[PDB]
Design a protein around this ligand. Structure first.
Ligand code: SF4
Ligand code: SF4
Ligand code: FES
Lengths: 90, 88, 46, 375, 107, 261, 169
């Protein structure tokens, strides 16, 4: 059931949020240190209407691997800067 | 075989093998045919075990190169039976 | 190119040589009012 | 240079010992299997050369078998003799490349240049029959492409008789060279059963002394009619695998003799025009010929719906094709077993606690090629 | 719904539609084989021309995609699992027809 | 309604109705040319021969109506030898034109040659070939590729209603071309370009422009008329190539106009 | 050969009787390839015995293929080749799976399947339970959508390119 999985995702937000300044530091990202956090919150808003049982936990499975990668310095400046779509024409 | 380790006087260990076999499978209800076949060959092979104190033709008798491995095959069957009833 | 002519009737044009030109095809000559241009070769006949 | 251009083995090394190598393949995942599905059978064949590219012929042979079973069709015998013959010259190619570059990784430098002269002379043969120096899309599902030119077999003879001195001289620079011995003799042993659990294939098995080998075991061609000695290893150290590489080279060199001595006259493509395109002299002068030509190249041949797993003794190990005809002319799914994939999976178990140079040598005994791993 | 699981950009689960149907026989053909079995074609989008060489350069991610099926209900349910907009169309088997060589010779 | 056995299984088939229609009802498909529903049956082009469960000689599938618990082995070997037998005859004269003939992508004759016809040639003489008969702004007659499934005349006399074109002569040299130069214009003249079995009759305006395996085949409806007939428009990437009718019982049924085409 | 078809047939019957809590059917492809079916929950127990002797000493996975098909109540269709050595012969068990149901990992039973779990996970949606470490391989980092999903464009939805204004791909 839901809610049991929502706590998981909150835990995940804690992990991401706290990790972010380390990400900006270690990666030498020049994104505003806030911006990554906000963007995290946004990505968390992207599926903020999913309602199926198993699908959400599956969502935190696919959510683990990314912090799993940034913590291991897997991915890179390019790969993590990728989320901001900054080169796109409006 | 590099992992294979030489084991003198297999026969004793063999008797422990087939006995542990028949015993651990001894809990099988007659229902499933597994007990039937596996006992069928088991007792046959073991019959050869008592029948063949010598090793040099013994492995010409079990029809398996290096009986020294197949004792571990039976060892696999032991944990196999350990699984058979967990599977019910 | 000059238009090739033969007093017979049907002729076969391979485009020059055997197995180095276009697939063998026979150009009919039922109408003398027109030349018999080859399908692939592009060589007229009459 | 030791990473073969496409490996990212990140590892948490200590002072200089490794603690765990962590391979990250996919650095050359060109994405093959998705592409294959959209292209008809005859148009899919080249991908296989593009796979284990060092061993370009045996892959083609693996495929053409994989189709002929589905298609229920048997090559004229001469074709089978070519298919084994170049299967073997390729056997020599991969072993040359393997033993050599494995030496180059540990700095031998020289044997390399002594051998690639020869390897170039072998590419003169792919050059001669296929028209390409390598990636010779020459083996066909129906059997074989063009017949080989008259002037060839004596030429192969003249080379093959003299190659053995070369391999031998190589062996004089290596097998006794006790520096080379010390570097590779206690690494990296794998338990003979533990190999089997990981599904190691080909030489990586024989090094640990298990008897198995597909050419003797489940022969697929005229291997019924060739005689050769499979060289079992013992200790399972890189050194034994090396001697297996060499000895298998000599044995292939035995096979070449027999194939040269029994190479029957006859056709080479299968008679069935529904599958094998008509010869040019014929297609240009009779209707059905031209039509089957046309449809074989337009739509391509259909295959009965079905599924299979063929496997053959590719030099690195068994090469495995699982494919499923939908009945259409485009195969539905074509999973490709890559023997290297399993090996490289087994590596980190095989290489814990070993010195960082030794993991480099041991990558080489795995004789892996990443193009095959990433498929 | 599995929209989050697929990495597909929202644009193409939204502003376009699938168009399930059983394909019509090519009429030049007299054959019937390819006719049967549902397939799940998507709608066409823009495709312009390469300024150089005149190639038909194209933007849309997934124009060429197409999928066979055994039953229509399975297809609709399929797209529903994907959360897809759809345009189901009827199988349109020809009516059986009477034929008679001798009716040609009534009088 | 009579019971009848397609090769094995029983089928409660409609009374009378041709053996062809029976196997059509079980869905197994007999090789065909001259026959065409929405046209008329004819005994020429005996590529439809099939073997009776017991009666020694094969009969045309679209001829004999089924009756009285018949069984029919479509896959019977004698049937197959029959079909190869005929196909070699059809291919004994059809000109080596596949690469240039505009019908080349999907000509039914090709596919029938693949599925059934023996692959080796064993004709070894000289094909007949014949001069063209010019016919109008549209159709590109070539003949020679003609196989005398009369079909097109059965189209003309029975639907277009014009009977200007027709068969001529006997034995070989017999021709489906109309005698006399006179042009054949009609409002259903376009549909024959669809109906024509091979490349013997193909649309001049579209000619050479494209190949069948290429074009995408969108489904829609005509607008030149409010009649609203269903169609398959065909485009070679970013540009329309050719139109074809899409069959629909309420309207066009496999046909289409001509101004729309 | 008739012979092999016989032996595989009888052996298929043999296993069919030995453990029929789950063998849906033991079809023999006529070109000598046996292949029993399995209820998806039943993967571990079958394969386990498949290593375990009776004759089924089929050690070493050859592969862990994952055929896809858009139809069916559950689309993805997993397949396991296997090889026995002393009796030199190959069989091929296989199952089926929902887009969402987590079937268990089979790494312990066949030993050399650790890489495959990761493969099929990143080439498909399907999840294997009791797997020590599923993670992406054969892809880029992010990338997201599984390929080989039988849908999903080969050209994908993305591309990299280097951009000087930001000095980065
Ligand atoms: S159309 Fe006429 S010519 Fe072109 S291929 Fe089919 S049959 Fe041969
Ligand atoms: S016209 Fe069309 S139908 Fe009549 S014969 Fe020539 S090709 Fe066959
Ligand atoms: S349709 Fe039966 S004879 Fe041509």
């Amino acid at each position: 059931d839901m809610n049991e999985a929502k706590r998981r995702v909150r835990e995940l937000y804690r992990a991401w949020y706290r990790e972010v300044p380390n990400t900006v530091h270690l990666f030498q990202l020049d994104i505003s240190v806030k911006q990554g956090r906000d963007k995290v919150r946004e990505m968390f808003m992207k599926n903020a209407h999913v309602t199926d049982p198993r699908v959400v936990d599956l969502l935190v499975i696919k959510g683990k691997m990314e912090l799993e990668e940034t913590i291991n310095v897997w991915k890179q400046r390019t790969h993590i800067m990728r989320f901001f779509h900054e080169t796109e024409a409006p | 075989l590099v992992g294979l380790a030489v084991c003198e006087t297999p026969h004793e260990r063999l008797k422990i093998l087939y006995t542990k076999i028949l015993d651990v499978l001894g809990q099988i209800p007659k229902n499933a045919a597994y007990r039937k076949y596996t006992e069928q060959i088991t007792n046959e092979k073991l019959g050869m075990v008592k029948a063949e104190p010598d090793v040099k033709k013994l492995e010409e008798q079990l029809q398996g190169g290096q009986i020294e491995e197949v004792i571990l095959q039976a060892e696999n069957e032991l944990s196999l039976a350990r699984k058979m009833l967990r599977w019910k | 190119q000059p238009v090739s002519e033969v007093g017979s009737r049907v002729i076969s044009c391979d485009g020059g040589g055997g197995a180095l030109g276009h697939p063998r095809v026979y150009i009919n000559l039922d109408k003398e009012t027109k030349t018999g241009t080859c399908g692939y070769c592009g060589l007229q006949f009459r | 240079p030791a990473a073969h251009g496409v490996l990212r083995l990140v590892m948490e090394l200590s002072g200089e010992m490794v603690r765990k190598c962590d391979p990250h393949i996919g650095l050359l995942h060109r994405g093959t299997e998705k592409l294959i599905e959209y292209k008809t059978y005859l148009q899919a064949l080249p991908y296989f050369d593009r796979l284990d590219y060092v061993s370009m012929m045996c892959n083609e042979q693996a495929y053409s078998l994989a189709v002929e079973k589905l298609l229920n069709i048997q090559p004229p015998p001469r074709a089978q003799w070519i298919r084994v013959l170049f299967g073997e010259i390729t056997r020599l190619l991969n072993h040359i490349m393997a033993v050599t570059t494995h030496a180059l990784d540990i700095g031998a430098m020289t044997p390399f240049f002594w051998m690639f002269e020869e390897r170039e002379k072998m590419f003169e043969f792919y050059e001669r029959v296929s028209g390409a120096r390598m990636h010779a899309a020459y083996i066909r599902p129906g059997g074989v492409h063009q017949d080989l030119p008259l002037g060839l077999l004596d030429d192969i003879y003249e080379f093959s008789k003299n190659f053995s001195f070369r391999i031998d001289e190589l062996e004089e620079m290596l097998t006794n060279n006790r520096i080379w011995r010390n570097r590779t003799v206690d690494i990296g042993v794998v338990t003979a059963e533990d190999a089997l659990n990981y599904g190691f294939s080909g030489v990586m098995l024989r090094g640990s002394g298990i008897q198995w080998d597909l050419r003797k075991t489940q022969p697929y061609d005229v291997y019924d009619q060739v005689e050769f000695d499979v060289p079992i290893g013992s200790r399972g150290d890189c050194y034994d695998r090396y001697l297996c590489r060499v000895e298998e080279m000599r044995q292939s060199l035995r096979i070449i003799s027999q194939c040269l001595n029994k190479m029957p006259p006859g056709e080479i493509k299968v008679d069935d025009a529904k599958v094998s395109p008509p010869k040019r002299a014929e297609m240009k002068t009779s209707m059905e010929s031209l039509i089957h030509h046309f449809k074989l190249y337009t739509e391509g041949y259909q295959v009965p719906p079905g599924a299979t797993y063929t496997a053959i003794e590719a030099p690195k190990g068994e090469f495995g094709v699982y494919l499923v005809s939908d009945g259409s002319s485009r195969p539905y799914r074509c999973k490709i077993k890559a023997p290297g994939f399993a090996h490289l999976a087994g590596l980190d178990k095989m290489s814990k606690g070993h010195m960082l140079a030794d993991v480099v040598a041991i990558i080489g005994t795995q004789d892996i090629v990443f193009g095959e791993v990433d498929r | 719904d599995i929209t989050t699981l697929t990495g597909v950009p929202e644009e193409h689960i939204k502003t376009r539609k699938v168009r399930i149907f059983v394909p019509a026989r090519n009429n030049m053909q007299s054959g019937v084989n390819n006719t049967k079995k549902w397939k799940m074609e998507f709608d066409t989008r823009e495709r312009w021309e390469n300024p150089l060489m005149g190639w038909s350069s194209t933007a849309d991610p997934l124009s060429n995609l197409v999928l066979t099926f055994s039953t229509k209900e399975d297809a609709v349910a399929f797209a529903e699992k994907n959360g897809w907009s759809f345009d189901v169309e009827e199988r349109k088997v020809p009516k059986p027809k009477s034929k008679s060589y001798g009716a040609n010779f009534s009088w | 309604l009579i019971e009848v056995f397609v090769d094995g299984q029983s089928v409660m088939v409609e009374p009378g109705t041709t053996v062809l229609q029976a196997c059509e009802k079980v869905g197994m498909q007999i090789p065909r040319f001259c026959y065409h529903e929405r046209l008329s049956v004819a005994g020429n082009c005996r590529m439809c021969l099939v073997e009776i469960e017991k009666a020694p000689k094969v009969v045309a599938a679209c001829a004999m109506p089924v009756m009285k618990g018949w069984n029919i082995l479509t896959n019977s070997e004698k049937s197959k030898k029959a079909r190869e037998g005929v196909m070699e005859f059809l291919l004994a004269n059809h000109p080596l034109d596949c690469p240039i003939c505009d019908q080349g992508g999907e000509c039914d004759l090709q596919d029938q040659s693949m599925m059934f016809g023996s692959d080796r040639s064993r004709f070894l003489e000289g094909k007949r070939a014949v001069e063209d008969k010019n016919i109008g702004p549209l159709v590109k007659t070539i003949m020679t590729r003609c196989i005398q499934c009369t079909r097109c005349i059965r189209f003309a006399s029975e639907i277009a209603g014009v009977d200007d074109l027709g068969t001529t002569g006997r034995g070989n040299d017999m021709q489906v071309g109309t005698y006399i130069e006179k042009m054949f214009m009609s409002e259903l003249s376009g549909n024959i370009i669809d109906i024509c079995p091979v490349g013997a009759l193909t649309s001049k305006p579209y000619a050479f422009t494209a190949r069948p395996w290429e074009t995408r085949k969108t489904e829609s409806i005509d607008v030149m008329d409010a009649v609203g007939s269903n169609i398959v428009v065909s485009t070679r990437t970013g540009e329309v190539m050719r139109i074809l009718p899409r069959m629909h019982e309420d309207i066009n049924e496999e046909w289409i106009s001509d101004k729309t085409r | 050969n008739d012979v092999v078809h016989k032996q595989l047939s009888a052996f298929g019957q043999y296993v069919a009787e030995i453990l029929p809590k789950y063998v849906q059917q033991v079809q023999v492809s006529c070109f000598n390839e046996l292949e029993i079916f399995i209820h998806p929950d039943g993967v571990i127990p079958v394969l386990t015995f498949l290593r375990d002797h009776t004759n089924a000493q089929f050690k070493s996975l050859a592969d862990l293929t994952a055929v896809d098909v858009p139809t069916r109540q559950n689309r993805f269709e997993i397949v396991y080749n296997l090889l026995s050595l002393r009796f030199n012969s190959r069989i091929r068990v296989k199952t089926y799976t929902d887009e969402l149901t987590p079937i268990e990992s089979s790494v312990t039973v066949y030993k050399a399947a650790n890489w495959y779990e990761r493969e099929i996970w990143d080439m498909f949606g399907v999840f294997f339970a009791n797997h020590p470490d599923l993670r992406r391989i054969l892809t880029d980092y992010g990338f997201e959508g599984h390929p080989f999903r039988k849908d999903f464009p080969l050209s994908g939805y993305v591309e990299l390119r280097y951009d000087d204004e930001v000095k980065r791909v």
